[model samples]
Target: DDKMDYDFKVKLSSERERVEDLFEYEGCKVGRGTYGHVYKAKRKDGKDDKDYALKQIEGTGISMSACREIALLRELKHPNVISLQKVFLSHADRKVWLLFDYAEHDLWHIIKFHRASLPRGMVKSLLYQILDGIHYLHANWVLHRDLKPANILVMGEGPERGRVKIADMGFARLFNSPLFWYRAPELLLGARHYTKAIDIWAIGCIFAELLTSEPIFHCRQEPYHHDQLDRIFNVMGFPADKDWEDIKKMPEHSTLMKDFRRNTYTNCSLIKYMEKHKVKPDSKAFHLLQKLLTMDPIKRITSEQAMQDPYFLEDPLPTSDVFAGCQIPYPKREFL
Candidate 1:
């Protein structure tokens, strides 16, 4: 149902004049995370009555991390990456608010709440757009370090409906850290110097989740770093020297290897696991997943190559809008 999302409130509230003058916030917060709180804001003078995501970056001063996000966001622009509309600095409140084009649905919301599993064509389209965004970032030698379903937003309406936009460019470092389930094995082995492969690993996990509607790796208890690694190794198999040539150079190689040797994890059957999870992808799609999930980052598929993968290039050629001709009614974002 096309319904009213925002309830009008007074134009100006107590805050720095600069921020209050430009936009009006909805009553409750839209979302929040370690980096910031998100609110739906309506521009005071905008020609169109469109909503924008106001990210209140948390910190005492204008944080270096917030600055990094602003700098990188300003330089990067793509259909697949969320756009930053404006920034408001509240000297009085000691806050930084970044304005971005608001998205109504995120991949996580769709994966969890949608009525049915996404069709193969829609999955192909979504992954293609994700790779397109990653390609743009990698071309500039920028690592998204953190990538997960929640960070992938889908536009709800207008010309770009159903298109994916990669959000949250703030986690270049391990400041808050990427979700462990999506983290690459090299990172688990404590490799300080990382590469774009880390992002691809995340894409692999997201792809798997898209197919199966659940994370591929998990732990029974609230787990530590090593336990996370154990879950990954159990599925992908403990990497041999042939799999990762630089394994010995990893800082945690000795420590993890001792445990790995004792466990002797050797069954590396991703195909079997996919079957077990009921993720019945076509051979081409499965092949692409294999390339993305390669144990060696050096051998992992690059965004450039992945865009050309047979899976995406084949039948039901990826749509720019994954939701084109969709019948399911996606739940709209609530203000709270």
Candidate 2:
């Protein structure tokens, strides 16, 4: 309750403090990406003895994308979503600095370094938390167009260590950037309106990777939209009209579907994929995956519906501490 109260006080405060007065930047880049860099910083006052991640995004001027991101993040507060603690502007560099909770491990690194598949309980726990965050976003009418392993962070060295924290939002749609590997079929088909179901579809992909320790719909090289769609159809199979009634409405439907119609294609069993990957499928997990991976966006399971899936309610229940009783020395986040 203390931390929650403190977060509320800072988030709701009208007064802004200078970055120099508030935090001591460690002068090291902890995370560097295309548009921004992140540094670990310590509070000047050490009131909570917590280190924060300061993300610096350079721009021609303080961009609208940053402003929109701030607006969206300011309204979101949840256990599974990373909290944006503060924001500041640097006029000289035309940059904005976003202060966020410091998370040591992202799912990308966690999954990459782990030996074989993650513990089954940990997989369920992580998936449940991801769905919880996605559910909250949909409930708030926000769509996280990009949902990939790199964007999901895990707390380290605290009461919340090993807890899932969904991160990296707002910029996905602002820049029309969708991480294509996890992209939903409708989006790839050039659907005009994005929906929350897109997020659910992505979660399905993530769920599969967590179990199989490899991407389910993989294209070894960077793929164009059509190429990626072909890969999905090969594995997920060409959808029947009953599977997606709106199939004819997608912008690229005619060209792609006509090509598919000429070729004989059969649905590849997801359970068989699991077996091939050496993951013994649970009936409930498979059931949820079927619903999540359904081709019809309208019929795709809602986040609310997903949280109620029988997989989560089954034996070997998801543990709150995803790393409980496990000893895997995951690599620390990179700093340079």
Candidate 3:
């Protein structure tokens, strides 16, 4: 609470006008989201200048969420993760602006335009970069609660394109948010304290979606969580009794189903579905994916471990050079 309170004030009183001015360049417009609008603005100098993405938060309606986004993005700096260029609050306009390097497209757009499923090797490569970025965040004690494809951006030019970068820290927290479905089963079953394993679970879901061309779990009703849990168990099998024994000890676990029988859904079978669709499963990448989607977060592979996995190390794509070449210096506000 102390940290949140402090960040809220800092975000409120910061120099927001200077930040908003950065969006005055050509091609700026509201991007997309529920809380606030992001703008894609180009540099005014027009000398090898690149576009910068800025998210504007107006007034204090959702100040808490905005503060959390600012705190997380400002602190999270990694090559595989989108960088926060600046954060400022304008008292005159009652708006907050967050500046970031503009990515050419989100993973959703790329997947749509490609019009075909991503190759297993390509998926593995992209997954590796995403995990690498997430590993960096986890090492710094951040948790990206949201890891869907829409939040992954593609930056750089030519051969460097398709390199994955994690974006949108608004839903992220400091190692303490309810894990989503396909995440660690312990969290799904009601564990209080969670860790970086949540991100791995997200990555697994993303990978599954990439392969299937649809969300792994799309139910959105109040019972959706339980339905999703069933979907995951149906596909991957439920955790061993001992695996989730500790979960039952948690207070919230009592209200939720604890003795549900494990069953498999033929329709949701990941391996079978992949084979049926002629989808390639990079063995190394699938191994890592299995590890991430494990029932126990404790046994799940860490981001550092995933980074060192041979699948990523041997992948020709998503190399360090890909990320290195895309690195651009933070432009001055005056240039806009």
Candidate 4:
């Protein structure tokens, strides 16, 4: 029902001025994360001017994570993924503005407004699109370290109502980092090298959030991180003690594992939860999530394989023909 019909032409010159003025950009501060604030900016011209989500990155005065994000986003081009329109770097104010295609609502907003549960079909559909976007990223050798509901945007209408595009690649890295809350267990247990599996782990957490409408690993007051470990164990069952016995040998495993259980949790079952919630598991989504969330990073599924999963190819594909109509020209390749 929310299908929009309009042509959008991103006036690069005008957009740059708005970013400079900062006063004219209006829509509202729709999101704020570890990196910066994302604003829903509206064009004043009103001549085929559509709403755009502008991520105003506050310069840290040191690192150019914002620049890196712009660079990465510019190189990406996919229908199921958020597209970068243009970027404006304000060295004077030590800030950067990232312009992107506007999405009606973020997954987090949808979940909160709906009181924590979405239609089973909607959830499956969203997951499929998310995987499609992530698959593209992985194919390009990029790891979206941060993959959560807040970063998933919904656009278009009807069957496309749940179509999602992954956003916010600021924290993403080609390597590994244990500081991220959503890091896979292997990374937390001290694996020296990491791969796209880190993204898969985050995707797993996202799936759990989709089902429960809450972060899968949130333990605010707990002295130990095991609170989240317990939650994960409850849903997927505990990992074998032997599975993590060698974890201690890793550099950070001894220190990190001190806060969680050595054995895996068996009672926590998502299968039953999905059934109780009337969410008939879509094998394609289920299979990909399981592979990506695997305890073993080596065994974790890759993006290419996930894309070929039969689930997305079934009757209702992940994307719609609307994307073809929305295609716009992006000439810039490198960071400006």
Best by lDDT: 1
The sequence of per-residue lDDT tens digits that candidate 1 reaches over residues 259-327 is 766345766567877888776645788889889999788899899999988787689899988886675
Clash pairs detected, candidate 1: none
Q: All candidates' TM-scores?
A: 0.87, 0.87, 0.76, 0.73
- Per-residue error (Å), model 4, residue 154: 1.6
Predictions in order: lDDT: 0.81, 0.80, 0.64, 0.63
Regions of model 1 farther than 4 Å from truth: 1-17, 114-117, 171-179, 220-224, 262-264, 280-282
lDDT of 3 by residue, 46-89 (tens): 55466777777756534667777776777677778988888766
**Tens digit of per-residue lDDT, candidate 4, span 1-336:** 145432322344334564635323554777676687787676656454566778877655435576577777778899788888877666457677788777776777666766532544556567767777888887887777666777787774333443577877645443454444465766555566556777788877777667666665655555125455555566666666554455456565556556556354445565655555544666555655667667766676666676676866765554443233343222211111
lDDT for model 4 comes to 0.63
Using lDDT as the yardstick, the better of models 3 and 4 is: 3
Q: How many residue pairs clash in each candidate?
A: 0, 0, 2, 6
RMSD of candidate 3 to true structure, Å: 7.3
Residue-level lDDT of model 2, residues 118-138, one tens digit each, is 878899999999999889988
* Candidate 2 vs 4: which has more TM-score: 2
Off by over 4 Å in 3: 1-22, 25-27, 45-48, 61-64, 114-117, 156-160, 171-184, 218-224, 250-259, 263-274, 277-282, 313-336
lDDT, model 3, position 102? 75
Worst 10 residues of 2 by lDDT: 170-179
Q: Model 2 clash pairs? A: none
